[PDB]
Design a protein around this ligand. Structure first.
Ligand SMILES: CC(C)(COP(=O)(O)OP(=O)(O)OC[C@H]1O[C@@H](n2cnc3c(N)ncnc32)[C@H](O)[C@@H]1OP(=O)(O)O)[C@@H](O)C(=O)NCCC(=O)NCCS
Ligand SMILES: CC(C)(COP(=O)(O)OP(=O)(O)OC[C@H]1O[C@@H](n2cnc3c(N)ncnc32)[C@H](O)[C@@H]1OP(=O)(O)O)[C@@H](O)C(=O)NCCC(=O)NCCS
Lengths: 395, 405
């Protein structure tokens, strides 16, 4: 057994040299396409709420303003008929939602993970850490265990289960991955964000209009990333360096976004002022992430590339307006919101994927739209803001 | 010290990525520098537990099941446990004291605000021992298997403690009995990769989430209820200890999580409309013991250290999942009866507090070592291992190096 003076030598040999870097992104979504134009019809019919004409017209108007074109779900109308309790408002339904989400979320997550590992190109044996993230379903052994099992990873992979961290969770996984990759030499972190929104699905209510609004936004999906420090030249494809990661709680805003896991499943509560809380405090979070690493915040926010969580169209609009951004800055975010909706934690991974793919296709200078520095933002319950400062690398 | 204000650790003036990384990372090993513990006020002695539990759950009529449970309680080697409820509190909730009546909502109403509250009590004690301002805590790792909510238990704990708005929070939900090891694993990378970082680890459990009436066809559930107790353990972990201010005790050298193949059905816990349903197979002590040595060999070899020929050369903080788990791990590793003393003392005075148990044992070990005037906080020994065991089967192996007194 080594001496007291040898402990530091072990630490020096154990830690990685460089910055945690995104080197692969894979995405997945369930097969059932739900176009937004017909969502009011489908939702009200599936939930047997066709008698509520006044609420349907109001919900249809909200759907037309969401700027979501389609969403994907692990269910169709036929599947929902087998679960009348899920399609009701307050009937006991957690058991059924758990029965679907507990095995379904890691299954969907694994699909995205497979695509990320395939792009990465290295053996799955080289994955040392697994960060699994979901707000849909909880179990013991957890979703991380299930994902590692389905992928057939090594028995000693260090796993991290990020349960119920909502819409900011896509930022949280980057924060986790940063420390895991950077503090461990040779470590390759598989990040998986997967969501099956059937956990939040229920019938519409007049007094609880904000729940229906959440159901008009949320879609299913999974995003997976391979993150590691010290990229192997000629083997790995380094894209985004995770330079600084900070989580911020906006004070006195707990009552804004609330989600409770009850006997009726996940109950969603949203105040009408959520886009305002996020937009008015986002700049302070950005100034903080830059100053934490000694970089002077840019005079023009258009100088950075952006991966904001598409919590809703109003969140994107108000953040864009407050940061004085040109319409093309949130192009990747708006394309994802349109094509897939709000996939909770999986959304930012989809945007980062869209950004690097379009940058590589257009032949730009870097993976981050030709720009050097950028920010990945997660927004959710708290109100919590996850600010991830990224430095993109050349093609 | 971290040397946050020193020139050698200063941030680069230009936006140099590697320069930022060099300045941002810590130098040394993540070190435990404070341990605070808390428990709810209601004492439930084990010698009368069979009587209290069967009466509180309207099951005293099942005579043969009571005689079987009284035998299990005598073999647990638990003397007393603490709970946030007494018999009077349980009468307000006949659904929790039943076997399968809808009860999750009531359990959530108790556990969602109760777990962070209990955790905060332990955290206040850890912060007081540490002696530095609470605003200097940069990371919060909250851990619980009792209650889930959005915003999570970590948020609530941070709010109750009055931590900085920019504290990096980690919520370890439903990682069970291995979670006390998981928090050390999280804290290690968080403290070591961030200069000046001071990680507050909080493990808090309110087992009322698992409480229900005994059943003849589900005897393994009652066995878990005879083991589980409430409690909280909080630790302050950080790299590069400030000499003269901080008290460096245990260095977290290597942390690895291992899954034992083909053992998923051994320990299962499902969160249902009836709360947390506990399932346990008879083969848990044997399976853990038959695979523990491989986990220890892995943790040692991962840092280039040759595994010791005699496991008695190390100090031990094993999760007291049950007396049989402790007995079989002790036997397999050919350990002397006193190596697991600290673990057995905590099991006796507090029972199995899920994730909080190992924190309590680490506290018991360092306190008794200091009280006896020993060489180090780890029973006078230099190297040791903290072990977490739970659903999977998952083993958390935490290699520790204890510093001198
Ligand atoms: C839902 C959304 C797409 C509608 O777009 P919009 O441009 O604001 O539309 P409108 O202003 O015409 O408003 C639609 C109606 O909904 C109302 N509304 C919006 N959000 C609401 C909420 N959370 N609760 C109750 N009513 C709400 C308005 O009050 C309005 O009705 P009114 O005329 O009866 O007062 C937009 O508000 C949004 O993007 N919200 C973000 C929600 C969010 O925060 N998601 C993430 C948290 S997980
Ligand atoms: C419960 C415990 C303290 C009892 O000590 P013990 O020395 O094994 O006692 P005994 O052998 O006299 O056993 C009591 C009765 O329980 C039975 N039993 C033990 N574990 C059981 C289980 N998981 N399920 C069903 N029966 C079980 C025996 O089968 C025995 O009865 P039987 O002769 O009628 O078949 C011990 O088994 C233990 O420590 N188990 C570890 C529990 C654990 O795993 N905790 C962590 C999971 S989070």
């Amino acid at each position: 057994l080594p001496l007291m003076e040898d402990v530091q030598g072990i630490r020096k040999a154990q830690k990685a040299d460089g910055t945690a870097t995104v080197m692969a992104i894979g995405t997945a979504h369930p097969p059932h396409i739900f176009p937004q134009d017909t969502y009011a019809d489908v939702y009200f019919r599936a939930t047997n709420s066709e008698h509520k004409v006044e609420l349907k017209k109001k919900f249809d108007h909200i759907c037309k303003k969401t700027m979501i074109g389609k969403r994907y779900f692990n269910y169709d109308e036929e599947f929902l008929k087998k679960y009348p309790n899920i399609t009701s408002y307050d009937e006991p339904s957690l058991n059924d939602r758990q029965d679907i989400c507990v095995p379904g979320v890691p299954a969907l997550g694994t699909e995205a993970a497979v695509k990320a590992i395939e792009e990465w190109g290295r053996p799955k044996s080289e994955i040392t850490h697994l960060v699994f993230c979901t707000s849909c379903g909880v179990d013991m052994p957890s979703a991380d265990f299930q994902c590692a099992k389905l992928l057939g990873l090594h028995a000693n992979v260090n796993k991290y289960c990020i349960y119920m961290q909502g819409c900011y969770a896509g930022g949280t996984v980057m924060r986790y991955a940063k420390d895991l990759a950077e503090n461990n030499r040779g470590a390759r972190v598989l990040v998986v964000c997967a969501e099956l929104t059937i956990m939040m699905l229920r019938a519409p209510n007049e007094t609880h209009l904000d729940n229906a609004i959440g159901i008009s936004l949320f879609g299913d999906g999974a995003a997976a990333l391979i993150i590691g420090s010290d990229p192997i030249i000629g083997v790995e494809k380094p894209m985004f360096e995770i330079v600084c990661t900070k989580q911020t709680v906006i004070p006195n805003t707990e009552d804004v976004i609330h989600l409770h896991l009850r006997e009726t499943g996940m109950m969603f509560y949203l105040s009408k002022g959520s886009p305002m809380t996020i937009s008015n405090n986002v700049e302070a979070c950005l100034i903080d992430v830059f100053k934490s690493v000694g970089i002077t915040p840019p005079e023009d926010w258009n100088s950075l590339f952006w991966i904001p969580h598409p919590g809703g169209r109003a969140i994107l609009d108000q953040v864009e307006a407050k940061l004085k951004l040109r319409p093309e800055k949130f192009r990747a975010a708006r394309t994802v919101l349109w094509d897939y909706g709000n996939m909770v934690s999986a959304s930012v991974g989809y945007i980062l994927d869209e950004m690097r793919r379009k940058s590589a296709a257009k032949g730009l200078e870097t993976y981050g739209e030709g720009l050097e520095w950028g920010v990945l933002l997660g927004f959710g319950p708290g109100i919590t803001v996850e600010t991830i400062l990224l430095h993109s690398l050349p093609l």
